[PDB]
Protein backbone atom coordinates (compact mmCIF):
# COMPACT_ATOMS: atom_id res chain seq x y z
CA UNK A 1 0.00 0.00 0.00
CA UNK A 2 1.12 3.53 0.83
CA UNK A 3 3.24 3.51 3.99
CA UNK A 4 4.51 7.04 3.47
CA UNK A 5 8.25 6.74 4.04
CA UNK A 6 10.43 9.83 3.65
CA UNK A 7 14.03 8.85 2.98
CA UNK A 8 16.94 10.75 1.45
CA UNK A 9 17.50 9.07 -1.90
CA UNK A 10 18.66 5.90 -3.65
CA UNK A 11 22.09 4.28 -3.40
CA UNK A 12 24.45 5.43 -6.19
CA UNK A 13 24.65 1.77 -7.22
CA UNK A 14 23.20 2.53 -10.64
CA UNK A 15 20.17 2.27 -12.91
CA UNK A 16 19.32 0.21 -16.00
CA UNK A 17 20.40 1.74 -19.31
CA UNK A 18 19.16 0.78 -22.77
CA UNK A 19 21.40 1.82 -25.70
CA UNK A 20 18.43 1.33 -28.03
CA UNK A 21 16.15 4.05 -26.67
CA UNK A 22 18.88 5.58 -24.50
CA UNK A 23 16.21 6.14 -21.84
CA UNK A 24 16.23 5.82 -18.07
CA UNK A 25 14.31 3.29 -15.99
CA UNK A 26 11.13 5.13 -15.01
CA UNK A 27 10.46 5.96 -18.66
CA UNK A 28 10.84 2.36 -19.82
CA UNK A 29 8.68 1.09 -16.97
CA UNK A 30 6.27 3.97 -17.60
CA UNK A 31 3.54 1.76 -19.06
CA UNK A 32 5.40 1.33 -22.34
CA UNK A 33 8.00 -1.43 -22.15
CA UNK A 34 9.25 -4.04 -19.68
CA UNK A 35 12.81 -4.16 -18.35
CA UNK A 36 14.48 -7.21 -19.91
CA UNK A 37 18.00 -8.63 -19.71
CA UNK A 38 20.37 -10.68 -21.87
CA UNK A 39 23.03 -13.33 -21.31
CA UNK A 40 25.82 -11.42 -23.05
CA UNK A 41 25.61 -9.07 -20.08
CA UNK A 42 23.61 -6.09 -21.31
CA UNK A 43 20.29 -4.45 -20.43
CA UNK A 44 17.48 -3.74 -22.89
CA UNK A 45 13.73 -3.14 -23.13
CA UNK A 46 10.90 -5.49 -24.08
CA UNK A 47 10.18 -3.75 -27.39
CA UNK A 48 13.69 -2.53 -28.18
CA UNK A 49 15.30 -5.94 -27.71
CA UNK A 50 12.38 -7.94 -29.11
CA UNK A 51 12.81 -5.72 -32.17
CA UNK A 52 16.59 -6.14 -32.34
CA UNK A 53 16.36 -9.93 -32.54
CA UNK A 54 14.27 -9.40 -35.68
CA UNK A 55 16.80 -7.04 -37.27
CA UNK A 56 20.15 -8.11 -35.83
CA UNK A 57 19.91 -11.53 -34.18
CA UNK A 58 23.14 -10.77 -32.32
CA UNK A 59 23.24 -8.19 -29.52
CA UNK A 60 23.08 -4.59 -30.80
CA UNK A 61 25.98 -3.87 -28.45
CA UNK A 62 28.48 -6.73 -28.18
CA UNK A 63 27.01 -8.53 -31.20
CA UNK A 64 27.69 -11.96 -29.70
CA UNK A 65 25.80 -15.19 -30.38
CA UNK A 66 22.72 -14.58 -28.24
CA UNK A 67 19.58 -16.72 -28.10
CA UNK A 68 17.04 -17.56 -25.41
CA UNK A 69 15.31 -20.83 -26.31
ZN1 LIG B 1 15.04 0.55 -24.94
ZN1 LIG C 1 25.46 -7.44 -25.43
The 3 state secondary structure assigned to the chain is: CCCCCCCCCCCCCCCCCECCCCECHHHHCCCCCCEEECCCCCEEEHHHHHHHHHHCCCCCCCCCCCCCC
Q: Is 59 annotated as a binding residue?
A: yes
Q: How close is the Cα of 56 to the center of ligand 1, in Å?
A: 15
Q: How far apart are CA 59 and CA 51, in angstroms?
A: 11
Are 33 and 48 in contact by the 8 Å Cβ rule? The answer is yes
Query: How was this structure obtained?
Result: NMR
Q: Is 40 annotated as a binding residue?
A: yes
Q: Is 68 annotated as a binding residue?
A: no
Amino acid sequence: GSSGSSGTGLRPSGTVSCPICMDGYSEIVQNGRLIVSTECGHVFCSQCLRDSLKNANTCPTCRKKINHK
